[PDB]
């Protein structure tokens, strides 16, 4: 209903220029701590009104799409899309840092997790008894602004003692150890199998169609979730022009309740909990325990993207439970009155590195993540 | 408040050196009571603060920082007893008060 | 040349009651040419008073009956008492 | 048959747009015109100044506007909704200008 | 040159603008002259009052101050020029 | 949605598995591990 | 009415601007608010709406502002806390 | 310790103060604070005004109480 | 030269390297050994 979007001046690189095709973040003086002075983001977009934002790039072989996505750094680091206005990050030590008279906010780094083994180490420099930070895991779903922990969408641990954050509540259940200025905590998150995740996503699919649906119409809604695929993707995202520059919108993922579903086995509203999963995590290379092992399944039919539901209903159609490539858990960081975390990616900065064959380096994933993106969509550009 | 500039004594914004000036090279009367600037400066400025407040309140209502003529009309004539005092004036580039008739109003 | 008005005492009496805003110059014209009036309008009055008493002096006793003659209703009773009040802090110091 | 506006929808518009803003109303050029030929009755070769065109514009049009006022409220006081010129020539004789 | 009927340069527009701004609704057509016959009485009385302090000043322009001064004058005072 | 039926179903799991397989290092002729990849599925 | 009011108001700039001139820090002399020199008597009681409400005990004309909206600033993940823990403690 | 010495209109301030010290030590650490002078203030606690010979301790003044400040503009 | 064209990663390579050939190769296209050779046959 709306044509591409047609390409500009800077858009058209050549061979000779090295400029950098997604136009570089704009930062701003924030504060100087750590004898360091840190940057806000000023002028590229954050996620807002339920929204992910990705800078575009003008790719000229390409017919259909004119477009591909792109993220701006070399290796895996934050994303500065789902951040919070007055969250601080500097090209030296890339420590997120909110000011003094900031508060709890939260930093996404842009690796998804899906499945198989992933492990990194997190830095942290000034944690204090009047600053702090929230370390761990969240989906796309958690909100930036809230810190991590208080919803079914993401898990954290405190920063003295470490109690073990969900839906608000400090848990107690690792062994107890406090941050300095010199700690390192290291993630061992075993994640099941995509085949694993894709049967019990079919099957909570076919559990929701019928099976508690015996609202003014439920076929709809049903047809919607006949039309629930494992991991086929249908995304919409399009190219815009905001502030002078090029980037995408994707859709993004809505807060719901909790998934229960009744097993007529056990007499109780059963909980969906992902098969095998562990949140190990070191304290200068010690082991701890697991944190948490019933992680939510979240793949098609337990997050609902954005949906028009008084215009396709009325109706070609797209779905609401959909895959996009950014479907799982990240890397996730809080930060709080001038606590400091950062994040470290490749085994040569990682000192505590256990040896297995499964796990893979955070920038290792975040290049299947540059493999998938052009791929499916030259996928979706026939 | 001071001791210099006269009108600093009054404590005053409105100049008692140009008024007093202006009374004698005017030709309202003979002689001009060292007084007299004083309270005419004084009344001056309440005005200019008067007319200048309901302006003020008439601009942020409207969202704008500064005051344009528009505003100084809607802040005389809509109040009750500067209207009657400026009845006569006419402020150039500012406007009508909004005001329809009942009968012309459709029903 | 030096033209003089009251370009800068209106605006020392805007950062007075409104301390953000500022004023187009069409509308300090207006403002320049509200108190050129105003004046003009008592010390007329406050001259046809002093000379119908047969008083050859402007004392401040004419212009506060001349502001409860042309000023109407209340901002007579608060030009007088903001008028006294300045009056009077102008001797005493 | 397409939207037409009733009549009478088109002057209540009129009305509450020209009452909201401050703009002059009467084109300046036929307004200049007419200046200088009503001042060559009484001195002949007269430059005016850019302003004193302006400033005569913005009274007479100050005059109409409170006059309209005045005449239609002499419509109304004779149940009608239409001003008619025995209605101006009433606003003016009780005002004492004819 | 010597024109003649520039009144007609006040237009019919521009009287029912006027009109309008000045809240009425619905206009006689005899307005539109009664209006540009007015109009003419008025602005007479404030150029030959106008001209009379250019005249006097021994100028040959009429200032702002004298459309100001001859509308003072007849009790039709005009802030805005001084 | 038909040409997105038929590759999603069958192309996408060992294609993506090829893609990511180039993603963690590179040969200087990665083109021919992809088809290398692609008979060895077959 | 409101006369008064607007010269009460006026009063106290008549008072502290006088001695405000080194400092200057905030210290409630911040001009103690813009928007409240206007306004308004207005009380609260019990309501016919509801258990409290808010009355004009002065006949107000036609586009007046009334009252600012006073209390905290806070951004909308912390009102999403508190809009539920005053629920959750049933406010 | 701390004190708050929240002024009549509605702001608050934050000092450093001693229990020991005179009402006239708080009040000149005021006038360093805003230039008031100390004979134009009041400070009153539990509605009582408090003299300037006379301690916080005296008063039963305590951690992170509002002291109340209340000044007289001079003149005119 | 377009490896800057798909953005600024240098792992996105790929743009310069890989991308035109097989998009050639699958915009054609049918099972998996004809596109076995369609990423042969740049090389
Ligand atoms: C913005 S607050 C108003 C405060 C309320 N007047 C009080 O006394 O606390 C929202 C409240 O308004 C009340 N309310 C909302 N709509 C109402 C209605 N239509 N009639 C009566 N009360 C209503 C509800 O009780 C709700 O707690």
Redesign the pocket.
């Known amino acids: 209903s709306v044509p591409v979007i047609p390409y500009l001046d800077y858009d058209i690189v050549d061979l000779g220029s090295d400029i950098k095709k997604p136009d570089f973040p704009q930062l701003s003086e924030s504060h100087r701590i750590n004898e360091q002075q840190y940057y806000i983001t000023e002028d590229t977009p954050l996620n807002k009104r339920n929204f992910m934002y990705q800078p575009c790039a003008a790719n000229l072989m390409l017919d259909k799409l004119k477009y591909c996505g792109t993220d701006y750094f070399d290796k895996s680091s934050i994303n500065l899309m789902d951040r919070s206005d007055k969250l601080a990050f500097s090209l030296d030590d890339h420590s997120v840092s909110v000011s003094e008279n900031c508060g709890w906010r939260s930093v996404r780094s842009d690796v998804c997790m899906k499945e198989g083994k992933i492990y990194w180490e997190v830095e942290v420099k000034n944690v204090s008894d009047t600053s702090h930070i929230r370390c761990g895991i969240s989906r796309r779903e958690a909100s930036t602004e809230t810190p991590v922990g208080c919803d079914f969408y993401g898990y954290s641990i405190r920063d003295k003692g470490l109690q073990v954050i969900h839906e608000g509540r400090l848990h107690t259940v690792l062994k107890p150890h406090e941050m300095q200025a010199g700690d390192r905590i290291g993630f061992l998150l075993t994640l099941p199998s995509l085949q694993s995740q894709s049967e019990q996503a079919m099957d909570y699919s076919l559990k929701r169609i019928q099976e508690l649906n015996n609202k003014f119409n439920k076929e709809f809604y049903k047809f919607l979730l006949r039309s629930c695929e494992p991991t086929n993707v249908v995304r919409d995202q399009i190219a815009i022009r905001y502030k002078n520059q090029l980037f995408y919108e994707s859709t993004d993922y809505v807060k719901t309740t909790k998934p229960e579903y009744y097993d007529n086995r056990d007499d109780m509203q059963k909980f969906y909990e992902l098969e095998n999963s562990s949140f190990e995590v070191f304290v200068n290379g010690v082991s701890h325990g697991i944190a948490f092992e019933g992680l939510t399944p979240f793949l098609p039919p337990f997050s609902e993207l954005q949906y028009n539901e008084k215009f396709y209903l009325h109706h070609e159609i797209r779905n609401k439970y959909v895959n996009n490539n950014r479907l799982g858990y990240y890397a996730t960081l809080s930060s709080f009155q001038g606590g400091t975390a950062s994040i470290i990616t490749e085994a040569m900065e990682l000192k505590f590195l256990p040896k297995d064959v499964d796990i893979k380096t955070l920038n290792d994933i975040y290049n299947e993540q540059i493999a998938s993106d052009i791929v499916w969509d030259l996928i979706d550009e026939i | 408040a001071k001791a210099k500039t006269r009108s600093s004594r009054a404590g005053l914004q409105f100049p008692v050196g140009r008024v007093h000036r202006l009374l004698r090279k005017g030709n309202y009367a003979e002689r001009v009571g060292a007084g007299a600037p004083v309270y005419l400066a004084a009344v001056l400025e309440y005005l200019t603060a008067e007319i200048l407040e309901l302006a003020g309140n008439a601009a942020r209502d409207n969202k704008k920082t500064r005051i344009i003529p528009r505003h100084l009309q809607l802040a005389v004539r809509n109040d009750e007893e500067l209207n009657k005092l400026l009845g006569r004036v006419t402020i150039a580039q500012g406007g009508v008060l909004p005001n329809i008739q009942s009968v012309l109003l459709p029903k | 040349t030096r033209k003089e008005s009251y370009a800068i005492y209106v605006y020392k009496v805007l950062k007075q009651v409104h301390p953000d805003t500022g004023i187009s110059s069409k509308a300090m014209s207006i403002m320049n040419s509200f108190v050129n009036d105003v004046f003009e309008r008592i010390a007329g009055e406050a001259s046809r008073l002093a000379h119908y008493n047969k008083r050859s002096t402007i004392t401040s006793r004419e212009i506060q009956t001349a502001v409860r003659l042309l000023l109407p209703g209340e901002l007579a009773k608060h030009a007088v008492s903001e008028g006294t009040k300045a009056v009077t802090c102008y001797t005493s110091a | 048959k397409p939207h037409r506006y009733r009549p009478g929808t088109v002057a209540l518009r009129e009305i509450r747009r020209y009452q909201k803003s401050t703009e002059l109303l009467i084109r300046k050029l036929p307004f200049q015109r007419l200046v200088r030929e009503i001042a060559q009755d009484f001195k002949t070769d007269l430059r005016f100044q850019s302003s004193a065109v302006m400033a005569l514009q913005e009274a007479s049009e100050a005059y109409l506007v409170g006059l309209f006022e005045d005449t239609n409220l002499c419509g109304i006081h004779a149940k009608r909704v239409t001003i008619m010129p025995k209605d101006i020539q009433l606003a003016r004789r009780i005002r004492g200008e004819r | 040159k010597v024109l003649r009927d520039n009144i007609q340069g006040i237009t019919k527009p521009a009287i029912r603008r006027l009109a309008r701004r000045g809240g009425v609704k619905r206009i006689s057509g005899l307005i539109y002259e009664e209006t540009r016959g007015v109009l003419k009485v008025f602005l007479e009385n404030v150029i030959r009052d106008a001209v009379t302090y250019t005249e006097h000043a021994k100028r040959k322009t009429v200032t702002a101050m004298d459309v100001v001064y001859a509308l003072k004058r007849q009790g039709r005072t005009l802030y805005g020029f001084g | 949605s038909t040409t997105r039926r038929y590759l999603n179903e069958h192309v996408t799991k060992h294609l993506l598995e090829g893609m990511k397989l180039i993603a963690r290092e590179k040969p200087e002729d990665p083109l021919r591990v992809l088809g290398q990849f692609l008979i060895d599925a077959s | 009415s409101s006369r008064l009011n607007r010269v009460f108001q006026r009063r106290f700039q008549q008072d502290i601007e006088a001695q405000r001139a080194a400092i200057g820090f905030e210290s409630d002399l911040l001009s103690l608010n813009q928007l409240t020199k206007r306004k308004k008597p207005v009380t609260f009681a019990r309501?016919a709406?509801?258990?409290?409400?808010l009355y004009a005990l002065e006949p107000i004309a036609a586009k007046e502002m009334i009252i600012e909206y006073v209390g905290e600033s806070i951004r909308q993940p912390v009102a999403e806390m508190r809009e539920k823990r005053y629920i959750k403690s049933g406010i | 310790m701390q004190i708050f010495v929240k002024t009549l209109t509605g702001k608050t301030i934050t000092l450093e103060v001693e229990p020991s010290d005179t009402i006239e030590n708080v009040k000149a650490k005021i006038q360093d604070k805003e230039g008031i002078p100390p004979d134009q203030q009041r400070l009153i606690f539990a509605g009582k005004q408090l003299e300037d010979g006379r301690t916080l301790s005296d008063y039963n003044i305590q951690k992170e109480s509002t002291l109340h400040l209340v000044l007289r503009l001079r003149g005119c």
């Open positions: 309501s709406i509801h258990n409290w409400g």
